[PDB]
Design a binder for this molecule. Structure first.
Ligand SMILES: O=C1C=c2cc(Nc3ncc(C(F)(F)F)c(NCc4ccccc4S(=O)(=O)N4CCCC4)n3)ccc2=N1
Length: 261
C-alpha cells in the first residue's frame, strides 16, 4: 500500500456510478512518475455505496491480467482512494466512433479476442463482470484494450445487453456473461453502435422470445457472426464457454493475419 502524500490530483476524469475518477500522478515509493486514475466514492449512500466500492476494491487487489485495468494501489482512510494506471485513449466506444476508417477487422477481432481472454481468467477466479460494454472498456494502445473494473463482482441495468435469464430472474452466471460478451463483440465490429437502439428496455425480452437477434455487422465474417449467434442461444447450455471462445476466436484471427498480404 501507498499514501496520500504520493498522489497528486490534476483534473476530474469523469463521474462514475461512484462519482469522480480523477486523473493525477502517483510517484514511486523509490522515485518514479506514473500517470494515474483515482476512483473515489460520490457524496455516498450510507452503506449501500461505500460497500460496493470496497467490494470492487477488494476484488481488484487479487486481479491480474494484461487485459483488465491495472490496479496500482489503494489508500484506505477517508476518501479511500483506488489507484489504477491511466489509459490515455479512453472509452473504446469513442475510440471507434472517431476511427471508423483507420481500423481493419483484424483489429476489431483482436479487441474481442482480448476481452474474451479477460473473461476466461475471470471465470477461473469465479468473478463475473456485469458491464462488458464498450463505454466500459479502455484502450491502452491501439493494439490493446483493458476491461472495465466496475461491473466486477462475486437500478440502471444494461438490459439491452443482458441474457433473458439475467432479466427474468436477475441471475448473472457465467453463461449470461457469455451472452453479454457477444453483445459487446457486436459493438466493437459495429464501431460503437448502441445494441437495440430502436427499442427501449420494457420490450426487449419479447424480442428475443419470438427469436430475434442483433443485425449481422458489416465488417464481421460469417463464422464469427455464427459464433455470436450461439452465445445468444436462448438455452444457456448451448452457449459456448469462455475457454471455448478463446481457442476459437484465436482461430478467426490467426485466420485473419492470413487474409492479410
Ligand atoms: O476523455 C477522456 C480521456 C480518458 C482517459 C481514461 N483513462 C483511464 N484509465 C484507467 C481508468 C480506470 F482504470 F479508472 F478504469 C479510467 N477510468 C475512467 C473511466 C473508465 C471507463 C469509462 C468511463 C471512465 S470516466 O472517465 O470515469 N467517465 C465516466 C463518465 C464519462 C467519463 N480511465 C479514462 C477516461 C477518459 N475520458
Amino acid at each position: 500500500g501507498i499514501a496520500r502524500e504520493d498522489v497528486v490530483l490534476n483534473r476530474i476524469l469523469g463521474e462514475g456510478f461512484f462519482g469522480e475518477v480523477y486523473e493525477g500522478v502517483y510517484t514511486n515509493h523509490k522515485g518514479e512518475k506514473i500517470n494515474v486514475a483515482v476512483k473515489t466514492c460520490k457524496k455516498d449512500c450510507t452503506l449501500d455505496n461505500k460497500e460496493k466500492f470496497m467490494s470492487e476494491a477488494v476484488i481488484m487487489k487479487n486481479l491480474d491480467h494484461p487485459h483488465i485495468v491495472k490496479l496500482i494501489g489503494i489508500i484506505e482512510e477517508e476518501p479511500t482512494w483506488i489507484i489504477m494506471e491511466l489509459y490515455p485513449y479512453g472509452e473504446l466506444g469513442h475510440y471507434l466512433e472517431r476511427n471508423k476508417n483507420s481500423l481493419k477487422v483484424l483489429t476489431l477481432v483482436l479487441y474481442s479476442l482480448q476481452i474474451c481472454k479477460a473473461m476466461a481468467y475471470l471465470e477461473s477466479i469465479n468473478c463475473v463482470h456485469r458491464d462488458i460494454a464498450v463505454r466500459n472498456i479502455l484502450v491502452a494502445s491501439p493494439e490493446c484494450v483493458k476491461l472495465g473494473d466496475f461491473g466486477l463482482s462475486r437500478t440502471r441495468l444494461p438490459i439491452k445487453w443482458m441474457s433473458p435469464e439475467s432479466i427474468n430472474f436477475r441471475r448473472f452466471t457465467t453463461a449470461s456473461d457469455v451472452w453479454m460478451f457477444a453483445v459487446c463483440m457486436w459493438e466493437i465490429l459495429s464501431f460503437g453502435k448502441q445494441p437495440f437502439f430502436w427499442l427501449e428496455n420494457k420490450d426487449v425480452i419479447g424480442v428475443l422470445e419470438k427469436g430475434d437477434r442483433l443485425p449481422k455487422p458489416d465488417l464481421c465474417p460469417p463464422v464469427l457472426y455464427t459464433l455470436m449467434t450461439r452465445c445468444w442461444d436462448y438455452d444457456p447450455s448451448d452457449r459456448p464457454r469462455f475457454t471455448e471462445l478463446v481457442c476459437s476466436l484465436s482461430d478467426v484471427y490467426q485466420m485473419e493475419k492470413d487474409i492479410a498480404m
